[PDB]
């Protein structure tokens, strides 16, 4: 595809009175998950979730296991620090989420990097786009920001994101080339569903596509139907492809005023669909 991403997603959830926090880590290349770690699982190892990652030698699995376990410990500590910063009790359950990653172009060049945290579902701290300073969302987060400024955490993360992250992504793309580079276009069709004598639903379907990025829109007389479109979230089929549909309620007899529009990287050209009885 024209650009690619490598992303890791970390979730810690405290369990007061039931031991250490639940810690789940998942790694993705674009929309394809390739590793996982789960503190509840018996192996206590980073585990493969895509076939091409099993091409990695044993050094890899040992090293990635060491890092994700160290990460779990740090975010465990992080949950505690946050309780103190926010003056919250030890009785409540809380969530700490962390994401990082890099985007690179099809030319192999770095586009952007991310390194950011959320606490109980709200932005806590994030590396800004220029990778040189931090967006801290509230008073607590300024303490962390001052701490990370003094230790030059931004420079360490910039070096990681522009270096190892990109190197890793390129290597994964090579090893998983046969699947990771595909841009399968959506198979599209439209269905018609009468609601009454006055109205019917037109539903535009996109099926079998990868990557998940897609634009599915309705127009009426060449005009955006943004505030009258029912648009579901892009959803996994389970077999490595994605699905989406968009629908509009149209007055009987007015079907031909409507067109469905489909943009997807796999398409030679954007699609315009009409109801063809």
């Amino acid at each position: 595809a024209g650009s690619h991403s490598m992303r890791y997603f970390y979730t810690s959830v405290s369990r007061p009175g039931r031991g250490e926090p639940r810690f789940i880590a998942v790694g993705y290349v674009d929309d394809t998950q390739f590793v996982r770690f789960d503190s509840d699982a018996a192996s206590q190892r980073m585990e493969p979730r895509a076939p091409w990652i099993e091409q990695e030698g044993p050094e890899y699995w040992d090293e990635e296991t060491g890092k994700v376990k160290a990460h779990s410990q740090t975010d465990r500590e992080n949950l505690r620090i946050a309780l103190r910063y926010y003056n919250q009790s030890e009785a409540g359950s809380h969530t700490l989420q962390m994401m990082f990653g890099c985007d690179v172009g099809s030319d192999g060049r770095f586009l952007r990097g991310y390194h950011q945290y959320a606490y109980d579902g709200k932005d806590y701290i994030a590396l800004k786009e220029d990778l040189r300073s931090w967006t801290a969302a509230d008073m607590a987060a300024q303490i962390t920001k001052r701490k990370w400024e003094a230790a030059h955490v931004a420079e360490q993360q910039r070096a990681y994101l522009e270096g190892t992250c990109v190197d890793g992504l390129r290597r994964y793309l090579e090893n998983g080339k046969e699947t990771l580079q595909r841009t399968d276009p959506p198979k599209t069709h439209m269905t018609h569903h009468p609601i009454s004598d006055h109205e019917a639903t037109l539903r535009c379907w996109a099926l079998g596509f990868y990557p998940a990025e897609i634009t599915l829109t309705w127009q009426r007389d060449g005009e955006d139907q943004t505030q009258d479109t029912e648009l579901v979230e892009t959803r996994p089929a389970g077999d490595g492809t994605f699905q989406k549909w968009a629908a509009v309620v149209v007055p009987s007899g007015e079907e031909q005023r409507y067109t469905c529009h489909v943009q997807h990287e796999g398409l030679p050209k954007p699609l315009t669909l009409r109801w063809e009885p």
Partner: peptide
């Protein structure tokens, strides 16, 4: 290949 994180 993952990076690292720091304490709050």
């Amino acid at each position: 290949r993952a990076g690292f994180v720091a304490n709050f």
